[PDB]
Amino acid sequence: SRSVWKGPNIVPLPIREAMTKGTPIRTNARAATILPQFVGLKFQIHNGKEYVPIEISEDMVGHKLGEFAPTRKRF
Amino acid sequence: MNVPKARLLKVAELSAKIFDQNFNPSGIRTGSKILNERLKGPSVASYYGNPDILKFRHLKTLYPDIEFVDLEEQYRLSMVEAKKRRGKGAPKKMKK
Amino acid sequence: GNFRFPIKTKLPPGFINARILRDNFKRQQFKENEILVKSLKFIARNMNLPTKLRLEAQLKLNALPNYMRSTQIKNRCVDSGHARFVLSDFRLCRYQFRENALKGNLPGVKKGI
Amino acid sequence: NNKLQHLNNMNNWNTQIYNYNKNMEIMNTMNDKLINKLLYKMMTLKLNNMNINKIIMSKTINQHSLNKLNIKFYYYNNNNNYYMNMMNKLMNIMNNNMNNNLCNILSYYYKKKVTIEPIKLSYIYLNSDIFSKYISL
RNA sequence: CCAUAUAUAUAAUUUUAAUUAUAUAUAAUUUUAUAUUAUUUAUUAAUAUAAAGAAAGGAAUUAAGACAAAUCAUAAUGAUCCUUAUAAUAUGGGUAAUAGACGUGCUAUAAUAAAAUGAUAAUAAAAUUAUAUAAAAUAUAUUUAAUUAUAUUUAAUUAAUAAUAUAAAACAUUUUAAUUUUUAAUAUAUUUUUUUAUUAUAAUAUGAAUUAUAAUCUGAAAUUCGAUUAUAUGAAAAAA
RNA sequence: ACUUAAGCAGUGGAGCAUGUUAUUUAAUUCGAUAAUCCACGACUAACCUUACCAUAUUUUGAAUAUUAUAAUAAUUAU
Ligand SMILES: [Mg+2]
Ligand SMILES: [Mg+2]
Numbered sequence: 001s002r003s004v005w006k007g008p009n010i011v012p013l014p015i016r017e018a019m020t021k022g023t024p025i026r027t028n029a030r031a032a033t034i035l036p037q038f039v040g041l042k043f044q045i046h047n048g049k050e051y052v053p054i055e056i057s058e059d060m061v062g063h064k065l066g067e068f069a070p071t072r073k074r075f
Numbered sequence: 076m077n078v079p080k081a082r083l084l085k086v087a088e089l090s091a092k093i094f095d096q097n098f099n100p101s102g103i104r105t106g107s108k109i110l111n112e113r114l115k116g117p118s119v120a121s122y123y124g125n126p127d128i129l130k131f132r133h134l135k136t137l138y139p140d141i142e143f144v145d146l147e148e149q150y151r152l153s154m155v156e157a158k159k160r161r162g163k164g165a166p167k168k169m170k171k
Numbered sequence: 172g173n174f175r176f177p178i179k180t181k182l183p184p185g186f187i188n189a190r191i192l193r194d195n196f197k198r199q200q201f202k203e204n205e206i207l208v209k210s211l212k213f214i215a216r217n218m219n220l221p222t223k224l225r226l227e228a229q230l231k232l233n234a235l236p237n238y239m240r241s242t243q244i245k246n247r248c249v250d251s252g253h254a255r256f257v258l259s260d261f262r263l264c265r266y267q268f269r270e271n272a273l274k275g276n277l278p279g280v281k282k283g284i
Numbered sequence: 285n286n287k288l289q290h291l292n293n294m295n296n297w298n299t300q301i302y303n304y305n306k307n308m309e310i311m312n313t314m315n316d317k318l319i320n321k322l323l324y325k326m327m328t329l330k331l332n333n334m335n336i337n338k339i340i341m342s343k344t345i346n347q348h349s350l351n352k353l354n355i356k357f358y359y360y361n362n363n364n365n366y367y368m369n370m371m372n373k374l375m376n377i378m379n380n381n382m383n384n385n386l387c388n389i390l391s392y393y394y395k396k397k398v399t400i401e402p403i404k405l406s407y408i409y410l411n412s413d414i415f416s417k418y419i420s421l
Numbered sequence: 422c423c424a425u426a427u428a429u430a431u432a433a434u435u436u437u438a439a440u441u442a443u444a445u446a447u448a449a450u451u452u453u454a455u456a457u458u459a460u461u462u463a464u465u466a467a468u469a470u471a472a473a474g475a476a477a478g479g480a481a482u483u484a485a486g487a488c489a490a491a492u493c494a495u496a497a498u499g500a501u502c503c504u505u506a507u508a509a510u511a512u513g514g515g516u517a518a519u520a521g522a523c524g525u526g527c528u529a530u531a532a533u534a535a536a537a538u539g540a541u542a543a544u545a546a547a548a549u550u551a552u553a554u555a556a557a558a559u560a561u562a563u564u565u566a567a568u569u570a571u572a573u574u575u576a577a578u579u580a581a582u583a584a585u586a587u588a589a590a591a592c593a594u595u596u597u598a599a600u601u602u603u604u605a606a607u608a609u610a611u612u613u614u615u616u617u618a619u620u621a622u623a624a625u626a627u628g629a630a631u632u633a634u635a636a637u638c639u640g641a642a643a644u645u646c647g648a649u650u651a652u653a654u655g656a657a658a659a660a661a
Numbered sequence: 662a663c664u665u666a667a668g669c670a671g672u673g674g675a676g677c678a679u680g681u682u683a684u685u686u687a688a689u690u691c692g693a694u695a696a697u698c699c700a701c702g703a704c705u706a707a708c709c710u711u712a713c714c715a716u717a718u719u720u721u722g723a724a725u726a727u728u729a730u731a732a733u734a735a736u737u738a739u
C-alpha cells in the first residue's frame with residue numbers, strides 16, 4: 001500500500017504468459033504498483049474508455065499503472 | 076528518570092505477565108489490534124430488521140377458516156385487468 | 172437467472188428497492204466474511220511473519236469481491252431508500268424522520284421548545 | 285397529579301419503549317411499524333363473495349414492558365349465539381387459538397411474550413383515526 | 422410551556438457537581454403614594470420622585486386568498502412510454518478537466534498586534550462513547566526535558582462514576598522587519614534589563630499559496646482523486 | 662407603513678476552499694430561459710454512495726396468484 005512499511009499493493013495479473021510469450025497484459029487494475037519485475041513488459045491500461053498501451057521502464061517502478069493512462073482529455 | 080530503565084522494564088514485563096497482557100518492548104507492529112478488535116457483523120446485518128416476519132402470504136397456511144382480503148393486491152390485479160381490457164398490457168417477456 | 176447476486180440473501184422485511192437490496196446483500200456478506208477478512212488483514216499487517224505470507228495475505232485481500240468490503244456499506248433510509256441525510260439514531264432520512272416524529276412513531280421524540 | 289384528569293405523555297407515542305441497548309429500541313420501533321401494517325392488512329374479511337366486511341382500526345399502541353409486549357388497538361365493525369362471524373374468528377386467532385395464534389408468532393418475532401388487545405368502538409366518531417379511515421371509504 | 426426567584430420531597434454528600442440533580446407548587450400582565458404637565462380634568466396618560474419587589478426576556482399555538490413544484494429528494498394515485506431494455510449485476514472512469522465569468526467562506530497584507538513560555542496545573546457550557554472511546558506509560562522524529570505527530574499497549578467506562586478533555590482568549594515576561602527608534606568597541610553615570618559621548622552599523626524575522634524529498638493515518642484500494650508530519654521552497658498581497 | 666436616507670460596527674482588490682455558469686469531455690448525472698436580477702440541494706462523491714460514460718454481463722428478475730414435477734415432514738394406509 002502507500003505506507004512503505006506496508007509494501008506495494010500487489011494484485012493478480014497474468015504475468016507468466018507475458019514472461020514467456022511476450023504478449024501484452026490488458027488490465028483495468030489502475031491501482032496496482034509497478035514492481036521491479038514488471039520492467040520491459042507491455043501493459044494495456046484501461047482509462048475508462050480505451051486501453052492505453054505502454055512499456056514498463058525502470059523509471060516507472062514504484063509508480064502505479066493508471067498514472068500513465070490519462071482518463072480525461074487535457075483541454 | 077533517576078530510577079533506572081531496567082527496573083521499570085522488569086516491572087512492565089512481570090505486570091503484563093500477571094494480567095494476561097502481551098509485552099512488546101521492541102515496538103514492532105505485531106498487529107494485535109486486529110485480534111482484539113470487536114466484531115461488528117451482527118449489528119451491521121440487523122440494519123433492516125430480522126428477515127423472519129409473518130407475511131400476508133403466510134396467512135392462508137396459518138388460519139384456513141378466516142379468509143383475508145389484501146386490498147392492495149386486489150387493486151393491482153384490477154388495474155392490470157383494466158390495462159388488459161384496453162390492450163395496454165405489457166409485451167410478453169422474451170423466452171430465452 | 173433467479174437472483175441478481177451470487178449468494179441467496181433473504182428479503183428485507185420493509186420497504187424495498189434495488190439499492191436497498193444491494194445494501195442488504197453487502198451487509199449480510201460482510202457479516203459472513205468478517206472473520207476471514209480480519210484474519211487476512213492480521214496476517215498481512217503482522218511484520219513479525221515472513222514477507223511472503225504478508226504478500227500472500229494482501230493478494231488474497233485484493234482478490235475478494237466487492238460485496239465483502241467493510242467500507243462499501245452505506246446507511247440508507249429504511250422507509251424510502253435514500254442514502255443521504257440518514258440519521259443513524261433512527262436509520263431514517265431527515266424527511267421520513269420528520270414525518271415519523273410528527274406522527275409519534277419514534278419513541279420519545281418531541282418538538283423542540 | 286391524577287390519572288383520571290390527564291393523559292400520560294407516554295401515550296403520545298405509538299411505540300412506548302426504553303431499552304439500554306438503543307439498537308434493540310430501533311429494532312423494536314421498526315418491528316412495531318411492520319406489524320402494524322400487517323395488522324392493517326388483516327382487517328378485511330370476505331366469506332365467499334358479496335360478504336366483504338372491512339374492519340376499521342386505529343393505529344396500534346405498542347406497550348413495551350420489561351417482560352412483555354401489549355399491542356392495544358381500537359376497531360370498528362359493522363341467532364348470533366350458535367355461530368361465529370368473521371370478526372370473532374379474527375380476534376380469536378389474535379389471542380385464543382391453541383395451536384398457531386398470532387400472539388405466539390409475534391412472541392417469536394419479538395423474542396418476548398406478546399399479547400394483543402382489541403377494543404370495540406360502537407361508533408365511528410369516537411376516534412379520529414377510525415373516523416378518517418371510515419370516511420376514506 | 423420555557424427561562425428566572427423561591428418552598429416541599431428525594432440523595433445513608435464515595436455516581437458529590439448539595440454551589441448540584443428532577444418532581445410537585447407558588448410568583449408578575451408588577452402593586453402602590455405623591456409632585457408637575459396635559460387630559461374627555463378623575464376613579465385618566467406622559468414623565469419624575471419615593472416604597473414593597475429576584476422579576477428582566479422568549480417560543481409555540483387559526484383559518485381565507487394568491488403565487489411558485491417535478492432533486493415534488495415534501496409523496497400518492499392516475500395518464501402515457503421501455504420490457505435483450507429507458508429494467509438488472511460487475512470492472513474501471515467521471516461527477517475534481519480550464520481560456521475565462523460571478524457568488525460563499527477561510528487565510529493574509531505587523532506594534533490599540535503577531536510569536537515563544539507560563540505543573541502542586543487561571544476560569545466553562547453543552548454533548549458523545551456495544552457498529553466505541555481511547556487514559557497513563559514506553560519508543561521514534563529529536564534534542565536533558567518539554568511541546569507536537571505517529572508507532573507499541575489497552576487502564577477504566579458502556580457511563581452524575583472513566584475517557585474524548587489540564588478549554589482558549591484573558592493576565593505576566595521576552596522578542597518582533599520597516600527603524601541610524603537598532604546592535605557593537607571604548608569610556609560614562611545617583612536612569613544600571615539603563616543614560617550619555619566618539620566612532621562603526623518598497624514584501625521583512627509579516628504572509629504561506631505553490632513546488633520538491635522522505636515518512637505516516639483510514640481502508641482491500643489514496644494513479645486519476647483523500648488527510649497528516651518533518652526537511653527545502655517562499656508567490657500574490659502594501660496606497661485609493 | 663415594508664424597504665430606503667442617516668449613525669455605528671464591519672467586510673470588500675491577493676491566495677486558497679467551495680458552489681454555479683461557460684467551454685471541453687466518452688461522461689463531465691439532475692436544476693433556469695414571457696427582457697431589472699436570479700439554473701446555485703449537500704449532515705462528508707477514492708470503490709459503495711450513483712443517479713452519468715465505456716466494456717462485458719442477467720432475463721418472471723423484489724413481490725402476489727395460477728398450474729405442474731422433485732425432497733421434506735404430518736397424518737390416514739406402498
Ligand atoms: Mg461510507
Ligand atoms: Mg513565516
Ligand SMILES: [Mg+2]
Nearest residue numbers: 512708709711
Ligand atoms: Mg460503479
Ligand SMILES: [Mg+2]
Nearest residue numbers: 706708709711
Ligand atoms: Mg463512483
